Write an enzyme that holds these catalytic residues in place. Structure first.
Site, PDB file in Angstrom:
ATOM      1  N   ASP A 185       0.748  -1.026  -0.041  1.00  9.80           N
ATOM      2  CA  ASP A 185      -0.144  -0.120   0.028  1.00  9.80           C
ATOM      3  C   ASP A 185       0.969   1.144   0.003  1.00  9.80           C
ATOM      4  O   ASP A 185       1.936   1.335   0.746  1.00  9.80           O
ATOM      5  CB  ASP A 185      -0.866  -0.195   1.170  1.00  9.80           C
ATOM      6  CG  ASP A 185      -0.079  -0.248   2.587  1.00  9.80           C
ATOM      7  OD1 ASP A 185       0.412  -1.409   2.552  1.00  9.80           O
ATOM      8  OD2 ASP A 185      -0.038   0.723   3.362  1.00  9.80           O
ATOM      9  N   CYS A 219      -8.263  -2.145  -4.473  1.00 14.28           N
ATOM     10  CA  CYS A 219      -7.187  -2.576  -3.506  1.00 14.28           C
ATOM     11  C   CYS A 219      -7.882  -2.426  -2.064  1.00 14.28           C
ATOM     12  O   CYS A 219      -8.737  -3.203  -1.686  1.00 14.28           O
ATOM     13  CB  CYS A 219      -6.082  -1.476  -3.813  1.00 14.28           C
ATOM     14  SG  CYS A 219      -6.815   0.171  -4.393  1.00 14.28           S
ATOM     15  N   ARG A 225      -3.603   2.214  -5.480  1.00 11.47           N
ATOM     16  CA  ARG A 225      -3.308   1.267  -6.661  1.00 11.47           C
ATOM     17  C   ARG A 225      -3.968   1.103  -7.769  1.00 11.47           C
ATOM     18  O   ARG A 225      -3.495   1.017  -8.936  1.00 11.47           O
ATOM     19  CB  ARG A 225      -2.911  -0.128  -5.720  1.00 11.47           C
ATOM     20  CG  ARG A 225      -1.683   0.147  -4.994  1.00 11.47           C
ATOM     21  CD  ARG A 225      -1.620  -1.006  -3.855  1.00 11.47           C
ATOM     22  NE  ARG A 225      -2.453  -0.729  -2.562  1.00 11.47           N
ATOM     23  CZ  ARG A 225      -2.489  -1.171  -1.829  1.00 11.47           C
ATOM     24  NH1 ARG A 225      -1.703  -2.420  -1.462  1.00 11.47           N
ATOM     25  NH2 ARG A 225      -3.418  -0.963  -0.539  1.00 11.47           N
ATOM     26  N   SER A 226      -5.445   1.077  -7.413  1.00 11.09           N
ATOM     27  CA  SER A 226      -6.223   0.971  -8.453  1.00 11.09           C
ATOM     28  C   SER A 226      -6.096   2.169  -9.425  1.00 11.09           C
ATOM     29  O   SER A 226      -6.260   1.799 -10.738  1.00 11.09           O
ATOM     30  CB  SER A 226      -7.712   0.896  -7.937  1.00 11.09           C
ATOM     31  OG  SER A 226      -7.769   0.284  -6.675  1.00 11.09           O
ATOM     32  N   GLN A 266      -2.068   7.836  -5.065  1.00 16.36           N
ATOM     33  CA  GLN A 266      -1.860   8.178  -3.793  1.00 16.36           C
ATOM     34  C   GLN A 266      -0.250   8.863  -3.499  1.00 16.36           C
ATOM     35  O   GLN A 266      -0.376   9.681  -2.481  1.00 16.36           O
ATOM     36  CB  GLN A 266      -2.192   7.452  -2.563  1.00 16.36           C
ATOM     37  CG  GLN A 266      -3.722   7.180  -2.480  1.00 16.36           C
ATOM     38  CD  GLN A 266      -4.257   8.340  -1.823  1.00 16.36           C
ATOM     39  OE1 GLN A 266      -4.158   8.750  -0.677  1.00 16.36           O
ATOM     40  NE2 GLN A 266      -5.301   9.114  -2.640  1.00 16.36           N
TER      41      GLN A 266
HETATM   42  N1  LIG Z   1      -5.194   7.960   4.842  1.00 19.01           N
HETATM   43  C1  LIG Z   1      -5.041   6.829   5.040  1.00 19.01           C
HETATM   44  O1  LIG Z   1      -4.411   6.217   4.999  1.00 19.01           O
HETATM   45  C2  LIG Z   1      -6.510   6.197   5.390  1.00 19.01           C
HETATM   46  C3  LIG Z   1      -7.279   5.862   3.750  1.00 19.01           C
HETATM   47  C4  LIG Z   1      -6.353   5.142   2.755  1.00 19.01           C
HETATM   48  C5  LIG Z   1      -6.121   3.788   2.978  1.00 19.01           C
HETATM   49  C6  LIG Z   1      -5.262   3.058   1.807  1.00 19.01           C
HETATM   50  C7  LIG Z   1      -4.889   3.759   0.521  1.00 19.01           C
HETATM   51  C8  LIG Z   1      -4.231   3.155  -0.661  1.00 19.01           C
HETATM   52  F1  LIG Z   1      -3.499   3.941  -1.500  1.00 19.01           F
HETATM   53  F2  LIG Z   1      -3.038   2.164   0.069  1.00 19.01           F
HETATM   54  P1  LIG Z   1      -5.050   2.012  -1.575  1.00 19.01           P
HETATM   55  O2  LIG Z   1      -4.269   1.122  -2.258  1.00 19.01           O
HETATM   56  O3  LIG Z   1      -6.069   1.299  -0.792  1.00 19.01           O
HETATM   57  O4  LIG Z   1      -5.650   2.875  -2.519  1.00 19.01           O
HETATM   58  C9  LIG Z   1      -5.527   5.037   0.565  1.00 19.01           C
HETATM   59  C10 LIG Z   1      -6.315   5.706   1.519  1.00 19.01           C
HETATM   60  N2  LIG Z   1      -7.559   6.658   6.264  1.00 19.01           N
HETATM   61  C11 LIG Z   1      -7.516   6.304   7.554  1.00 19.01           C
HETATM   62  O5  LIG Z   1      -6.728   5.278   7.794  1.00 19.01           O
HETATM   63  C12 LIG Z   1      -8.477   6.917   8.364  1.00 19.01           C
HETATM   64  C13 LIG Z   1      -7.793   7.672   9.531  1.00 19.01           C
HETATM   65  C14 LIG Z   1      -8.504   8.778  10.244  1.00 19.01           C
HETATM   66  C15 LIG Z   1      -9.001   8.533  11.726  1.00 19.01           C
HETATM   67  C16 LIG Z   1     -10.032   9.547  12.210  1.00 19.01           C
HETATM   68  C17 LIG Z   1     -10.338  10.760  11.420  1.00 19.01           C
HETATM   69  C18 LIG Z   1     -11.283  12.096  12.016  1.00 19.01           C
HETATM   70  F3  LIG Z   1     -10.979  11.818  13.667  1.00 19.01           F
HETATM   71  F4  LIG Z   1     -10.544  13.272  11.941  1.00 19.01           F
HETATM   72  P2  LIG Z   1     -13.017  11.967  11.656  1.00 19.01           P
HETATM   73  O6  LIG Z   1     -13.395  13.234  11.882  1.00 19.01           O
HETATM   74  O7  LIG Z   1     -13.009  11.297  10.358  1.00 19.01           O
HETATM   75  O8  LIG Z   1     -13.485  11.062  12.868  1.00 19.01           O
HETATM   76  C19 LIG Z   1      -9.912  10.930  10.013  1.00 19.01           C
HETATM   77  C20 LIG Z   1      -9.101  10.000   9.442  1.00 19.01           C
HETATM   78  N3  LIG Z   1      -9.186   5.672   9.385  1.00 19.01           N
HETATM   79  C21 LIG Z   1     -10.402   5.382   9.323  1.00 19.01           C
HETATM   80  O9  LIG Z   1     -11.183   5.782   8.563  1.00 19.01           O
HETATM   81  C22 LIG Z   1     -10.730   3.901  10.192  1.00 19.01           C
HETATM   82  C23 LIG Z   1     -10.916   4.595  11.663  1.00 19.01           C
HETATM   83  C24 LIG Z   1     -11.837   5.963  12.065  1.00 19.01           C
HETATM   84  C25 LIG Z   1     -13.177   5.561  12.446  1.00 19.01           C
HETATM   85  O10 LIG Z   1     -13.878   4.754  11.671  1.00 19.01           O
HETATM   86  O11 LIG Z   1     -13.510   5.444  13.385  1.00 19.01           O
HETATM   87  N4  LIG Z   1      -9.796   2.957  10.334  1.00 19.01           N
HETATM   88  C26 LIG Z   1      -9.876   1.669   9.706  1.00 19.01           C
HETATM   89  O12 LIG Z   1     -11.045   1.586   8.848  1.00 19.01           O
HETATM   90  C27 LIG Z   1      -9.210   0.627   9.632  1.00 19.01           C
HETATM   91  C28 LIG Z   1      -9.501  -0.592   8.879  1.00 19.01           C
HETATM   92  C29 LIG Z   1      -8.313  -1.857   9.010  1.00 19.01           C
HETATM   93  C30 LIG Z   1      -7.099  -1.619   9.665  1.00 19.01           C
HETATM   94  C31 LIG Z   1      -6.862  -0.369  10.307  1.00 19.01           C
HETATM   95  C32 LIG Z   1      -7.789   0.654  10.310  1.00 19.01           C
END
Ligand SMILES: NC(=O)[C@H](Cc1ccc(C(F)(F)P(=O)(O)O)cc1)NC(=O)[C@H](Cc1ccc(C(F)(F)P(=O)(O)O)cc1)NC(=O)[C@H](CCC(=O)O)NC(=O)c1ccccc1
EC number: 3.1.3.48
Length: 287
Positions: A185, A219, A225-226, A266
């Site tokens: 990732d 992904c 990645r997509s 990304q």
């Molecule tokens: N930014 C990030 O890394 C990722 C997104 C991401 C991941 C992978 C990729 C990629 F490029 F790798 P891909 O190949 O999949 O396209 C691109 C983007 N985002 C995130 O990781 C955000 C981070 C976040 C936390 C709190 C806030 C907030 F407090 F401000 P609020 O107001 O929203 O509550 C905002 C953003 N997290 C999340 O959205 C939830 C936690 C927040 C919640 O739902 O309470 N986490 C997970 O879903 C999770 C799943 C599996 C394993 C570990 C974690």
């Protein structure tokens, strides 16, 4: 023809002067920004993998259900190139039925997976397909049965053959699952060569054929990645199609593509590696 010399040059200017991060940030600041209301409703709170990754309402894929039609997935429709994809996040444990329902309703023939279940001790995707061999699942909520058939495993990717059946009508379809297994990732593919080879397995299977429903690409969030995968694919198309392959503006195309889903590609290096893979894979294609 001669044209191919224009791209490596152009690519080199960017490389030597490391103008990648700059270009990427330009593309960002320029990206479209449409509303994702439906994604944010309370009932769809648990139908999303990440808070900051959502489908635009103008292009989200709608499920054929009377109650809740939401799924985190967008439809990317590239007119000129005449190709369409469905980019979606890696399925959730409660979202697997939905995933396969979308495949069925959209008449997709192939599914491309660019991430991994196990990514850094964390679950980045649910096990939405049979593992053993001849293993068979069932999705109560959507009335679909899924069955493992074939499974050519390799060093950078795996190709599985699946049989998906509508339990209501007993209609079956063969779905091809292309799983690239070595793409961290936010990282890049093991090498352009392995990547391209992969895109070719996919292309040659006819899954990208327009006589079919758009292939489903995903992904973990379904944008990094997509986005890279589709950008490359589309660009390579545009080259084969235009008299002069160079006229293809990678930046312009990605911005056009981002009109349908947010944050496609990304990192600055995914953008880079994207110029590269298009340029390299351009050799064989344009001859
Ligand atoms: N930014 C990030 O890394 C990722 C997104 C991401 C991941 C992978 C990729 C990629 F490029 F790798 P891909 O190949 O999949 O396209 C691109 C983007 N985002 C995130 O990781 C955000 C981070 C976040 C936390 C709190 C806030 C907030 F407090 F401000 P609020 O107001 O929203 O509550 C905002 C953003 N997290 C999340 O959205 C939830 C936690 C927040 C919640 O739902 O309470 N986490 C997970 O879903 C999770 C799943 C599996 C394993 C570990 C974690």
């Amino acid at each position: 023809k001669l044209e191919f010399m224009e791209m490596e040059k152009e690519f080199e200017q960017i490389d030597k002067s490391g103008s990648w991060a700059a270009i990427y940030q330009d593309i960002r600041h320029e990206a479209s920004d449409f509303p994702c209301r439906v994604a944010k409703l309370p009932k769809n709170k648990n139908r999303n993998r990440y808070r900051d990754v959502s489908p635009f309402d103008h292009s989200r894929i709608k499920l054929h259900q009377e109650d809740n039609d939401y799924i985190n997935a967008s439809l990317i429709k590239m007119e000129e190139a005449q190709r369409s994809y469905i980019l979606t996040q890696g399925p959730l444990p409660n979202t697997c039925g939905h995933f396969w329902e979308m495949v069925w309703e959209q008449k997709s023939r192939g599914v491309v997976m660019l991430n991994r279940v196990m990514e850094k001790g964390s679950l980045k995707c649910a096990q939405y397909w049979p593992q053993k061999e001849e293993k068979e699942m069932i999705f109560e909520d959507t009335n679909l049965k899924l069955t493992l058939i074939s499974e050519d495993i390799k060093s950078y990717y795996t190709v599985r053959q699946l049989e998906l059946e509508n339990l209501t009508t007993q209609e079956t379809r063969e779905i091809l699952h292309f799983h690239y297994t070595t793409w961290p990732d936010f990282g890049v593919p093991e090498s352009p060569a392995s990547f391209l080879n992969f895109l070719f397995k996919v292309r040659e299977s006819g899954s990208l054929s327009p006589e079919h429903g758009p292939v489903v690409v995903h992904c973990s969030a379904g944008i990094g990645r997509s986005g890279t995968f589709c950008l490359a694919d589309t660009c390579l198309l545009l080259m084969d199609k235009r008299k002069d392959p160079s006229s293809v503006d990678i930046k312009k195309v990605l911005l056009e593509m981002r009109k349908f889903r947010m944050g496609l590609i990304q990192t600055a290096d995914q953008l880079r590696f994207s110029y590269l893979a298009v340029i390299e894979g351009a050799k064989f294609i344009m001859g």
